[PDB]
């Protein structure tokens, strides 16, 4: 015969074998397994499950009670009446699907505040392998929920009614604070379809009005129909006509963010965000994603305040330390200030000693003034049109759309009533460029702060005067008790911390590799525990037992990589989960991460955002994780089952020499 | 956000969309469709179905009657008693599966002679678009069937009891008739596992005893367990111990070949073939597939009698004609002789005129003498060990196994009785190297025939003396009426034939392409029709209407590429089928052919055997097929729906300039 080679035949066999769970279970039985250093079992199977259910039951009652609270009026917003449903057709169907988001010809939405909380699987594991009291107390503080109406409206009010301060800012200043590589900018003078096809986004996210579908679902309608229509009115300078005739094309949706929330403040705090039309966000994303890819970060340019793009792996963690040590005496030499969104890392020296500040902004978006927003858009647009002047006028028009989306977009909340922010001031969270808008506003305030240090106002190192400064001079609210300068351990020993403070949600720590120091992320056990027992996903009954077991395995690998392996208790807990995962679940074919397993949830491991596990049946050992954060003495990801490949293929090669003598 | 690009998002939609038939049907509803040349409809669906069921009913009845006939005794074979079931274990399971092929501890088989007949879907199409009488009488002539017990035993007896003539053959003569490229030989001095993993075979073919499973199912058992055991006994020269302990490791199975058979002779003709153990055939395949890849063909070396490797596309068809014209005057200069297994093409000149002979051997495997078989194995082994002398002893041992497999393997037929061919003479059809063994035996015969012409015996050009010659001097049986010399049209005009004879099942034709001649394969309409209405697949229970419609589409393309496009009537029928195929079926994602659609059944289009369509939603037009058989002037395969991609994606790119001036 001659159809396919035996080698190819073996390969095909291997591929279908990893989809046969019963086959994997049989063949991997009694196989040599790499076991993690796990914590001892603390209670039986049934006990752990019952304790987890008790917590879940209590959290569900707290959510239900808080969701029962009445919410304030929305009178703090301007009301615009009702919008007609978009009647634009694309071939054989309307872009606005019939029988959805339609109340008698008017666009409508309904906010969902479900009673269901996060799954109990991870919490069960916590009770199984850790202290009952600590697990219970930790789990009862936080829950993954839709939030509440009362907390939603309260938080919405806070960021749409705050008195802002217009920043004193120019292009020249932004060039100093946010340098970039012009050669990294996308050629926006190219054809628009190709540019739009280049932007990246969440395929599962809402495409907003008028699509009312996921982005991947609405993608042809956006590209083939609405976008050319939008383009035609832009270049003819006829947007008002399009706005007036098809208002849903410029309509946003104000949604409640499903998230981890503090139980005690459920009725006062639920974060709003705005979902804009797909065509608008995608068009603007050309500039926004181009610019963010060209931005220098602080560790590359000491004049930069920008942390937007910083990542921990590949020496990133140590780069932070090296950069921070360059901080000078307050009032004599420049400090070291890092801005990523509303998160800030400040370093200064006092009498030669390095101090670190990590303060929190309170609802920063409500403090972002219209001047800053316009200045950022102008800066981003100018950066491109200086590089590619032949396309200036088109992208300056897009810039105007951008500013409107960030400040004055009409939006739905619940029902048919259309609202609008009373003032331009205040950033509409969720708009494209949100992180940059926040980063610049923060950097501008901290730049002024640093200038006042050089002016001689050294009492701005103190919380009371610092908080007053940011409020009065920049309209920013620093949470009381979060401005606490800490003495930095500039050259930490093995197992020692940088400080106890967090930047981008993580502590900085030094661990041992051979005789060299490696800077790695770190958290207290209870912080790892909180993340672990509150996964960001609801109860789905379609999820089979196998999928749920695999999820625990993937999330455990995720936390370890993020730095849980560097905390002994967290290491032992994640180790228990891994060791408890069945062989067939470890070695089965998975879809997530391109067949390599779901990537960690933490978003700042790499700059491009995407972290890839080498293999889906891989074990995140201490040595391997350390290798991820060092500039490299590289390491393979060890397999949980070293003999998995041969056992699954039911064949291990043995050398058979043809050159042997016989007679 | 940021997860994947809109471009990648679009491509991901495109993949999903071609798997959604309901969506395809909708989005391709009013699409511009390019139609192939077609014959008009001759009757309605219900009429075609009724006529199709009528024919099928008669064929089933004829098969049942023929299968009812009693068969001869099998005492013409040696009886070896019964073999014990192999008890070799591979980990947690036996290599010979429990509860299968086991009659009280003894190996057993059961021949399958079912009354099942090929599907009637293709036959229905024929009634729809062609002449009722012609379609009916053509369909009644042949049928795809398991054969009969009577014909099976009769044919087995004929190829195991024929008196053969031992050929006079040396390495020197074989080097003359079958030259090869030594540099193209596989390095058989390398490690054995890598070599064996390199051979190619049919994944769903039987792995034979003791596996009693498909090759892909039994592959780990063979590789990890049996093969190292076989290797160990070979290198220790201890095969006898292995044979005596585990006889099933060397047992073959004699099977009835399911095939297209003439209804007239169902009770007298069912072809037997042998299925050898996978470890033995795979090991031998290392030498055999290496050698066939290194062999020269007639059109590369004018001294070669070898056709084994010839293919029609990319100028191959014209290469045949060019090679054939070199034939000289009979008795003065050498003729042109080409051997492909049991198929031969012979050219000679008389009074300057070019003549062609295409005779048929009657069951050639029965005539393949043991001397020829041993000589071929020796030639193949020597070829490798002369190029790679460090592995000489191992492959010489394999050569001995090869000879045994081809002549003397014990085998089952039906039940537990083990049989063996009485004489060494006679090739056990199905053994690795079958084609080569046949090719050489024929070439040796025709080489001797050619020599006698040079010695002045010109009466051997006549059938009477030719048949006598091949019988008495080489033990070969030329079928009467098949030795018929025909005048060759040496330079055929447009639409004319080389001759009306066939080589490798096809005629040779000249067709027009841009006022230039292209040599192409051809068949008369009835031959294309016969193949069309008799597909090589029984009615299986699981196949949906969609899969059945796609199969019609694929088979129609297959025949067109094979040459049906060059016969107007056959083209019209294939085009009618293609054009009546639903849009969603044409454009849907398919698994066969690497996603390009199932390749043609005809095996000699390319030398590597692998033919692949450019696209799964294209159709074989005249211009494209001609481009395949020409050396150059290639062509794009035309799409049935030119706008399919944009329609399915629901997106057509339009240029939006960012460099426009908006104000002043």
Protein model, in words:
- The structure is a homodimer.
- Chain A is globular and about 90 Å long.
- In chain A, the strands form six sheets. A five-stranded mixed β-sheet of chain A has the order 2-16-15-9-11. Chain A has a four-stranded antiparallel β-sheet with strand order 12-13-14-17, with helices on both faces.
- In chain A, helix 4 (121-129) runs antiparallel to helix 5 and helix 18 packs antiparallel against helix 19.
- Chain A is 41% helix and 11% strand.
- Chain A contains 23 helices and 19 strands.
- Chains A and B meet through strand 1, helix 1, helix 8, strand 8 and helix 9 of A and strand 1, helix 1, helix 8, strand 8 and helix 9 of B.
- Strand 8 of chain A pairs antiparallel with strand 1 (4-5) of chain B, so a sheet runs across the interface.
- The PDB classes it as transcription.
- Keywords: Polymerase, virus, RdRP, transcription.
- The assembly is dimeric.
Topology:
2 copies of one chain form a homodimer.
Chain A: E1 4-5, H1 6-17, H2 21-27, H3 45-67, E2 78-81, E3 89-90, E4 93-94, E5 102-103, E6 106-107, H4 121-129, H5 132-139, E7 142-145, H6 149-158, H7 171-177, H8 192-198, E8 200-201, H9 215-235, H10 239-245, E9 252-256, E10 259-262, E11 272-275, H11 278-294, H12 316-325, E12 336-340, E13 343-350, E14 353-357, H13 370-387, H14 392-407, E15 411-412, E16 418-420, H15 434-455, H16 463-474, E17 486-487, E18 507-513, E19 516-522, H17 525-533, H18 545-562, H19 568-580, H20 583-587, H21 592-595, H22 622-629, H23 644-649
Parallel strand pairs in A: 9-15
Antiparallel strand pairs in A: 2-16, 3-4, 5-6, 7-10, 9-11, 12-13, 13-14, 14-17, 15-16, 18-19
């Amino acid at each position: 015969p001659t159809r396919l080679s035996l080698e190819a035949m073996l390969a095909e066999r291997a591929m279908v074998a990893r989809q046969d769970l019963a086959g994997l279970k049989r063949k991997l039985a009694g196989a040599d397994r790499v076991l993690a250093p796990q914590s001892p079992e603390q209670c039986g199977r049934e006990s752990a499950q019952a304790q987890a259910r008790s917590v879940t039951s209590e959290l569900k009652s707290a959510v239900k009670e808080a969701q029962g609270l009445e919410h304030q009026t929305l009178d703090f917003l301007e009301q615009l009446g009702e919008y007609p449903v978009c009647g634009i057709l694309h071939g054989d169907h309307p872009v606005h699907p019939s029988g959805t988001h339609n109340n008698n010809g008017k666009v409508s939405v309904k906010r969902q505040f479900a009673a269901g909380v996060n799954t109990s699987d991870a919490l069960t594991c916590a009770f199984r392998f850790e202290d009952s009291d600590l697990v219970r107390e930790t789990a009862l503080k936080t829950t993954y929920t839709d939030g509440t109406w009362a907390g939603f409206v309260q938080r919405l009010k806070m960021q749409t009614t705050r008195k802002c301060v217009q920043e004193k800012v120019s292009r020249k200043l932004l060039k100093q604070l946010f340098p970039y590589d012009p050669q990294k900018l996308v050629d926006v003078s190219g054809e628009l379809s190709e540019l739009v096809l280049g932007i990246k986004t969440n395929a599962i996210a809402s495409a907003g009005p008028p699509y009312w579908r996921t982005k991947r679902d609405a993608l042809p309608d956006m590209l083939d129909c609405v976008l050319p229509l939008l383009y035609d009115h832009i270049v003819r300078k006829d947007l008002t006509t399009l706005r007036n005739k098809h208002p849903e094309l410029f309509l946003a949706e104000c949604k409640n963010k499903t998230d981890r929330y503090e139980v005690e403040s459920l009725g006062e705090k639920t974060r709003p965000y705005f979902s804009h039309p797909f065509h608008l966000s995608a068009l603007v994303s050309v500039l926004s994603q181009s610019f963010s890819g060209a931005l220098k970060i602080m560790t590359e340019d000491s004049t930069s305040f920008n942390a937007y793009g910083f990542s921990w792996t590949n020496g990133g963690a140590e780069d932070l330390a090296i950069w921070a040590r360059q901080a000078g005496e307050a009032g004599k030499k420049p400090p070291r200030i890092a801005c990523y969104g509303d998160d800030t890392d400040i370093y200064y020296r006092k009498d030669g000693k390095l101090y670190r500040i990590c303060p929190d902004f309170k609802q920063m978006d409500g403090s972002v003034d219209a001047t800053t927003i316009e200045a950022v858009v102008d800066y981003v647009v100018d950066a491109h049109v200086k590089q590619y002047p032949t396309a200036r006028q088109f992208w300056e028009e897009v810039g105007k759309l951008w500013v409107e989306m960030a400040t004055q977009s009409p939006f739905l909340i619940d029902g048919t009533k259309v609202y609008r922010k009373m003032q331009k001031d205040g950033l509409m969270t969720g708009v494209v460029g949100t992180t940059l808008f926040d980063t610049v506003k923060s950097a501008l305030a901290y730049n002024d702060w640093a200038d006042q240090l050089m002016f001689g106002s050294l009492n701005l190192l103190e919380e009371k005067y610092a908080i007053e400064f940011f409020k009065n001079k920049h309209g920013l609210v620093i949470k009381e008790g979060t401005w606490k300068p800490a003495l930095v351990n500039e050259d930490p020993g093995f197992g020692e911390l940088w400080t106890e403070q967090k930047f981008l949600g993580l502590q900085l720590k030094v661990v041992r590799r051979e005789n060299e120091k490696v800077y790695v992320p770190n958290l207290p056990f209870e912080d790892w525990l909180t993340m672990w027992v509150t996964p960001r996903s609801k109860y789905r009954s379609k999820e089979t037992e196998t999928m749920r077991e695999r999820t625990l395995f993937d999330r455990a690998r995720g936390l370890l990589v993020t730095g849980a392996v560097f905390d002994e208790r967290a290491r032992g807990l994640m180790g228990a989960v891994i060791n408890s995962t069945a062989p067939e679940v470890v070695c089965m074919r998975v879809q997530e991460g391109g067949g390599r397993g779901a990537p960690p949830a933490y978003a700042f491991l790499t700059r491009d955002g995407v972290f890839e596990f080498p293999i889906s049946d891989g074990y995140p050992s201490y040595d391997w994780v350390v290798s991820l954060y060092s500039r490299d003495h590289p390491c393979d990801m060890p397999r949980v089952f070293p003999e998995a490949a041969t056992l699954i293929a039911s064949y291990r090669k043995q050398v058979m020499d043809t050159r042997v003598v016989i007679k």
